[PDB]
Design a protein around this ligand. Structure first.
Ligand SMILES: [As]
Ligand SMILES: [As]
Lengths: 244, 244
């Protein structure tokens, strides 16, 4: 018994008009005959061409980041602007943004609350570094990151939340991934509620390929993927098939 | 005797599909009969619709920010991606990005060098805070910011550089603006070269409206504008006319 799986593409800061048109065509031709939420997150400037060309009924378009409000924030894209554009998914707290772009736990938690309150589906990213893993701090870190997010949310917000676990420490066996997912679900179950925990999607966001996806999705607490490199390739289709 | 003026719109983090279509239509109908480089910088997600609808022969589209390279930089837009898209202008070092998003002098200077080397026109922003102005540090600060940028550039790069002076301290009389522009030009003249200084555009990026633009452009060291709030309005056309 699992909730609806999600297979999300994080294109990060990659792509050309040519490469995106070729990829979206193949994604459009792929017949998906099971209940799965597919997500593509392009770079901001590619969002329009993706919205225009993507016809696959299982897909939604997501942003890779956002700020809460419109105004004098040169270079940033706000959640109101995204909604006007027709985008209602957003990735927040990706490890790259936590590492390079000043997104502390509190910044991430406030962004998630803002997205929730403006009616977004949120893929919120957590995960521990190699230094943190080698000091035995996996549980403390992922639970503390999740706790920061949970602190700004009412119980009913969780239908709009998806967690994505990034094993930053590896940039992992399916068993190491399962152990962290289980630990996350246990926390949500005890602290937030049993019903909320059952229904929550916890996506694996380490290295996902056509080669390992099926074995990863066999695990009871893995509800799909936040895919990096392989989501720039026709291989993404096979990763979607692996959640049958 | 002045170099070609530039009138650049910084839309910051503002706009709807509806408001942009209405604005671009009016900008498209505006007949401009003098030599001026017009620039529109939309939020990243609006770049496609602006490129698609904007027909005015005096305009180029600009990004409001960028990073140097494509790759694993979730949420950011790279200069290669912009070029593939057909964008060859970029605003860098805006005060909002210096203040809120970690852009030190060195970060800004490296971004400007990267843009130069990838063939962009760059509007590089400098300016001092109220605290800096009240401690008599206007010259030191704007010259130190310009120096950080100049340090990463060969002499021949300056044909691709435009400076924009932001009087952050006011968020200013035309005479206070002129005094800073003159001081910037003097520095470039003595340190970089007389020929480079004559030809360089120094844009005023404080509060510009249809009401004050003509008086501002009368000043000998002001070569146009980086416009904030008024560039979201039909008033922008009159600001363009003021550089006749
Ligand atoms: As189709
Ligand atoms: As036209």
């Amino acid at each position: 018994a699992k909730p609806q799986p999600i297979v999300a593409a994080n294109w990060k800061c990659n792509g050309t008009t040519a490469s995106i048109e070729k990829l979206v065509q193949v994604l459009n031709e792929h017949q998906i005959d099971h209940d799965v939420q597919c997500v593509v997150a392009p770079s901001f400037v590619h969002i329009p061409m993706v919205q225009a060309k993507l016809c696959n009924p299982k897909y939604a378009v997501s942003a890779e980041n956002a700020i809460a409000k419109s105004g004098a924030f040169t270079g940033e894209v706000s959640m109101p602007i995204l909604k006007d554009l027709g985008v209602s998914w957003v990735i927040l707290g990706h490890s790259e943004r936590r590492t390079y772009y000043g997104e502390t736990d509190g910044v991430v938690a406030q962004k998630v609350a803002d997205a929730y309150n403006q009616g977004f589906m949120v893929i919120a990213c957590i995960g521990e570094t190699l230094q943190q893993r080698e000091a035995n701090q996996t549980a403390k870190v992922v639970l503390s990151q999740t706790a920061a997010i949970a602190a700004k949310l009412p119980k009913e917000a969780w239908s709009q939340i998806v967690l994505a676990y990034e094993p930053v420490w590896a940039i992992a066996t399916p068993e190491q991934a399962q152990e962290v997912h289980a630990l996350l679900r246990q926390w949500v179950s005890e602290k937030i509620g049993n019903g909320v925990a059952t229904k929550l999607r916890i996506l694996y966001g380490g290295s996902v390929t056509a080669g390992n996806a099926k074995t990863l999705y066999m695990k009871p607490d893995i509800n799909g993927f936040l895919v990096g490199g392989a989501s720039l390739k026709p291989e993404f289709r096979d990763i979607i098939d692996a959640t049958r």
